């Protein structure tokens, strides 16, 4: 198919052939499995102290005093699971493998599939993104990589009728739950993904809900955040071309 | 919903009488315990059998059937064509950590083949010649007498 290239003014400037991979059949299940794995693998190992609740010589008196056979010390119950200050019976364990494996084939397939979901205006719209465009993904001249001010990228997006998505992500959610006590107080929608070729767009990265990536290593997560296909993306003339061989 | 997930409230978690799930006694012994007594059933019999030759006095033959060779003659475009001629040593994988390459005669031979290998079986030979072919024995193959 065709890809309409845009100049830093938002005006059409020729067009390139949309590589084949963007035609790869959308397989949300595989995508979901790749995002699941990526997220699991970055989880840290944890678990309680191996000796918690065992640091004591508490003993049970046995029969004879009308007391249940519970270990006690200084007349205070201890060690056993049912006692206060006793050991956790089946607690978290450092030894547990909390990582997930995934065949390179199955994973690359999902990357390709996520890529393809990007070129479907309906999907992108369903995924939730806000925009008033017909063609997708948004392709732009490599001159984009030279921008430096965020503000400039904004004008360009407003001209590309895609700024509305950043307006969407310009809202933080104060989460329900104690995550808050652990530094996870906030969370926000995901907006546009900027895929460049040489280096991630420094000028666009601070944009609300935006994520910047590079054609050589852009992955399933940035292509389909949360395992949801169809992320409003903007490729770079060159980026678009590199992506084709992934 | 999994089975485990439905266990809360069952009291016995499918163990039957609560007097069941205790120690190794419910298993009749630890590990292979009783493989000769109460649980002899479905355990290979006791005893020694035969012998083994030292590992380094052992020879591992890399093998391949004519059917394989034959089914991919055309596909082996990168291998001699004549009146085909193929050096098996260059076909068989594992032909390195192998003491020698041997061609076996399983399947059919629908082409005229000239095979070069360290060894051949009767069937391999009959079949390869039967299709107007020949079998060439390698220098290593010069170990027949």
């Amino acid at each position: 198919m065709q890809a309409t290239i845009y100049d830093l003014d938002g005006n059409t400037d020729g067009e390139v052939d949309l590589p084949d991979v963007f035609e790869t059949p959308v397989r949300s299940d595989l995508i979901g499995k790749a995002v699941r794995a990526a997220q699991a693998n970055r989880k840290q190992d944890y678990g309680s102290d191996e000796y918690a609740g065992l640091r004591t010589p508490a003993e049970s008196f046995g029969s004879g005093r009308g007391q249940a056979h519970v270990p006690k010390l200084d007349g205070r119950a201890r060690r056993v699971p049912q006692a206060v200050k006793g050991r956790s019976a089946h607690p978290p364990k450092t030894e547990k493998d909390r990582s997930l494996d995934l065949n390179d084939k199955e994973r690359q397939l999902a990357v390709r599939s996520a890529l393809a979901a990007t070129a479907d205006a309906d999907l992108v719209a369903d995924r939730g993104h806000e925009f008033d465009r017909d063609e997708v993904p948004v392709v732009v001249s490599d001159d984009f990589e030279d921008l430096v001010k965020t503000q400039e990228v904004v004008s360009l997006l407003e001209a590309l009728d895609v700024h509305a998505d950043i307006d969407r992500a310009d809202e933080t959610k104060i989460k329900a739950g104690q995550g808050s006590a652990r530094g996870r107080k906030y969370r926000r929608p995901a907006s546009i993904l900027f895929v460049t070729s040489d280096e991630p767009s420094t000028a666009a990265r601070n944009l609300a809900g935006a994520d910047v990536a590079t054609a050589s290593e852009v992955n399933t997560e940035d292509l389909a955040p949360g395992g949801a296909p169809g992320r409003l993306t903007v490729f770079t003339e060159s980026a678009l071309a590199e992506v084709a061989e992934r | 919903t999994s089975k485990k997930k439905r266990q809360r409230g069952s009291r016995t978690h499918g163990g039957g009488s609560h007097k069941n799930r205790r120690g190794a006694g419910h298993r009749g012994g630890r590990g292979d315990a009783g493989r000769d007594k109460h649980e002899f059933h479905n355990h290979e019999p006791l005893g020694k059998s035969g012998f083994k030759r030292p590992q380094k006095v052992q020879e591992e033959a890399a093998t391949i059937d004519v059917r394989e060779i034959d089914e991919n003659v055309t596909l082996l475009a990168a291998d001699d064509v004549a009146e085909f001629r193929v050096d098996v040593r260059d076909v068989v994988e594992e032909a390195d950590d192998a003491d020698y390459v041997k061609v076996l005669g399983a399947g059919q031979v629908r082409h005229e083949l000239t095979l070069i290998a360290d060894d051949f079986s009767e069937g391999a030979r009959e079949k390869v010649e039967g299709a107007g072919g020949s079998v060439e024995l390698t220098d290593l193959g010069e170990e027949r007498q």
Binding site: P25, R27, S28, D29 | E71
Partner: protein, 115 residues
């Protein structure tokens, strides 16, 4: 409980054709695909070549694999083909998706089931 949205859709299409058109193979293939993946068909060229015949579409309620040799010029329809299989088959015949088969022949006529 199938996970593949595609496999899922194929199966629904196979039914719609078996019901509407007079097809019976399509409904037959549908039921086998609904069954556990382990029971699905995994056929190599050697078997297709042995029992197929020209002008009779070969239907594999599974996947076709490239072991062996195929010379007959037949049309094979499967859920999927390994890359080698689809290459060997198009050299002497035609590899076709079950979704195309359902469209070029909703009546499921002159078809042979191989597994």
């Amino acid at each position: 409980s199938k996970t593949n949205p595609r496999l899922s859709s194929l199966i629904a299409d196979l039914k719609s054709a078996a019901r509407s058109s007079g097809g019976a193979v399509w409904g037959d293939v549908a039921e086998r695909l609904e069954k556990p993946r382990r029971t699905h068909a995994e056929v190599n060229l050697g078997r297709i070549e042995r029992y197929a015949q020209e002008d009779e579409t070969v239907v594999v309620p599974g996947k076709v694999l490239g072991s062996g040799v195929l010379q007959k010029d037949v049309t094979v329809a499967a859920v999927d083909f390994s890359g080698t299989a689809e290459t060997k088959i198009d050299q002497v015949g035609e590899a076709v998706s079950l979704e195309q088969a359902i469209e070029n022949n909703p009546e499921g006529s002159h078809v042979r089931v191989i597994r």
